[PDB]
Ligand binder design. Structure first.
Ligand SMILES: Cc1ncc(COP(=O)(O)O)c(CN)c1O
Ligand SMILES: Cc1ncc(COP(=O)(O)O)c(CN)c1O
Lengths: 401, 401
């Protein structure tokens, strides 16, 4: 034996560390701002009603558990493309796109990364925003690509470094790959405004870059599925053939069921079929065929008028609670007599927020108030409730005054 | 655009070809022996009662859809290792194994291949039997390992080439990797007998090879969970610390739910934690966390005595039906006046059977008898029913007489 004597202990995960330290707390006033999933007003996981209805429908039909085609459930992939591109999209209607079911957003990004490693002969470089979701790195690196970065978040104003971004992208070598978060940037919450997006499209177009969109929060960010997909749809309409990863983790609350899709925009239907064949050849030896449950659920909801309708109400409800907590946090901090500028908290979008707090403050926050978050000043707004937002604002004031 | 113009349409699957032809056929006597999933006596997909019961249970408990840890559902991984190693296994009891949930057997095989690519510094060569499941090649190849082969199947007798296997294995450089099918070899159905396995184990031990067991049919092969895992358990007992992939696709009919696990036998519990940390680092950037449905069902079955008990009867029924068909096929070939030796048919184990039929004979069976199979003489015993076994016997007789 002794095959593994040299395998060393891997680095501990921080996020993991806060949660655990959180559990190990007695203060009934403790807050976990490191939670990576949506939580209702009571701090409880939320299974959507439309989701429970879908499950009841599936159960009633006594469906089989036979393997899905390599590319997944057809009703799912098509519905997925339609949600993303829009019903009257030319890309959709002409069938010049190919969508394959992936294991949620992450599996989709990986299949996508592996596809580029294999067929994107023009470059090996993937440009990520500074900063980006932690997983983005190992995803591409493990896939065999080289990581690069473009300026994005401005720590001075806790907002978008629009000028740095524009300057960086303008200098990116032609035919390089650039990853863009479609909405609700993770981890900052900083997104470009419609007008800045128009401008990015143009440079991306001019530099002839391959735009890789990561769309994990459609509908969940603003409560509007069309508005959340505006940027993606704009690029395509501008003639930029992007590639895209979708997740239904947050927007349908399908977390553990793992429903997602990877999409490639092609020149035509014929090209789309060649691409599809190669995507299937790549996935087979990865995991053979995808998990059916989440896809069956998502497909029902998307394809059933009544359920789809209930879904939009529920997603909006989620988006709204988030926006509400953002609004209430700022109002409360003001009322506390805090003199700092906290408008970034409300200018931010989605579940994650870069507060600007410093490490020593985060620490004070953790030590004296039982408020757990990562040292980067990033908080999950999902961890804030109507009942604790007050306590949170209070604490933040104390540590920052 | 114009990014994918150089992407060529990938080669088509021959098995797909067989299925499509089968579907097009109008002869009500048509048989599909290219089928890769179990079918009941009526030729229909079979969801086990214990599976329906486990599902109803989940529903009843109104469980959340929260993300599972990277390594998967703890109850599932533990029960999984226990199923494989046996409750009284020293390996199990001492906790010197690490099991992680994978996307069925395939994902589990890939995670394993990627793990070795990364940490198995001793070699890059993976020796597969001739032949092996088609997907084994690209799995290992895509992971970055080099493929080798060792003699296994003897076309002369439609059985094990013990001499060739033994001769090949004896010349494998120390510390190389060898892939072994635990039971129900895919695609021949030819498995070593106990005495043969004892000799194989001795050489594997002596040459200090890392044994990688692919266990995709535990309990489904012979109807006995213990007997199916005999060889695996024997290697471990002899002091060979193997790596193993388990699938619940067949044994539990979980096909599309994708429940599987990857296991590493370690020196001690200490070493196991380190390896486990490295597996987590590998998986995160692959798909982040595993699909929960299949694991939940599997865990419930294994962990609930009432259900586990019912599962064993059910898996036994599946196994018995297949054996039954093998028996009946041989008997009818005699009854038809077949002068040939059809023993291999009853000697073989599991869903696949290498008949020995030649390419031209297969053609006739297809062309004249509407019996669909691949040109390799391989048949899926699942496609055979009490109602058509007689016809098959008839047809085989006609084309080989
Ligand atoms: C930007 C980003 N992309 C990818 C994902 C992956 O999500 P999942 O794999 O859980 O679907 C997420 C996590 N919600 C994300 O925030
Ligand atoms: C030998 C072998 N190993 C791996 C697998 C993959 O099974 P799955 O991915 O469907 O669980 C199978 C298919 N049952 C198999 O025959």
């Amino acid at each position: 034996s002794s095959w593994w004597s040299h395998v060393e202990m891997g680095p501990p995960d921080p996020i993991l560390g806060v949660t655990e330290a959180f559990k190990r707390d007695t203060n009934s006033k403790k807050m976990n701002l490191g939670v990576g999933a949506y939580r209702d007003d009571n701090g409880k996981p939320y299974v959507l009603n439309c989701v429970r209805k879908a499950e009841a429908m599936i159960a009633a039909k006594k469906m089989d558990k036979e393997y899905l085609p390599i590319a997944g459930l057809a009703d799912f992939t098509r519905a997925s493309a339609e949600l993303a591109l829009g019903e009257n999209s030319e890309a959709f209607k002409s069938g010049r796109y190919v969508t394959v079911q992936g294991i949620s957003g992450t599996g989709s990004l990986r299949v996508g990364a592996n596809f580029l490693q294999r067929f994107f002969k023009f470059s090996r470089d993937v440009y990520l925003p500074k900063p980006s979701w932690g997983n983005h790195t190992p995803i591409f690196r493990d896939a065999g690509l080289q990581l690069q970065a473009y300026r994005y978040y401005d720590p001075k104003t806790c907002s978008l470094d629009f000028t740095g971004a524009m300057e960086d992208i303008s200098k990116i070598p032609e035919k390089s790959i650039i990853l863009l978060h479609a909405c609700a940037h993770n981890p900052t919450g900083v997104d470009p405004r419609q007008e800045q997006w128009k401008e990015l499209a143009s440079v991306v177009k001019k530099r002839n870059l391959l735009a890789y969109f990561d769309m994990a929060y459609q509908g969940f960010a603003s409560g509007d599925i069309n508005r959340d997909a505006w940027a993606l749809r704009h690029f395509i309409e501008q003639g930029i053939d992007v590639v895209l990863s979708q997740s239904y983790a947050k927007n349908m609350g399908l977390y553990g069921e793992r429903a997602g899709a990877f999409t490639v925009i092609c020149r035509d239907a014929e090209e789309a079929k060649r691409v599809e064949s190669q995507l299937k050849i790549l996935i087979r030896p990865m995991y053979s065929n995808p998990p059916m449950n989440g896809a069956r659920i998502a497909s029902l909801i998307l394809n059933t008028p009544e359920l789809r309708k209930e879904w939009l109400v529920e997603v909006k409800g989620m988006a709204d609670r988030i926006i509400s907590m953002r609004t209430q946090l700022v109002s409360n901090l003001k009322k506390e007599g805090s003199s700092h500028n906290w408008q970034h908290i409300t200018d931010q979008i989605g579940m994650f927020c870069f507060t600007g707090l410093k490490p020593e403050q985060v620490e004070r926050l953790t030590k004296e108030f039982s408020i757990y978050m990562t040292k980067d000043g990033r908080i999950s707004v999902a961890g804030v409730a109507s009942s604790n937002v007050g306590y949170l604002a209070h604490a933040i004031h104390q540590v920052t005054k």
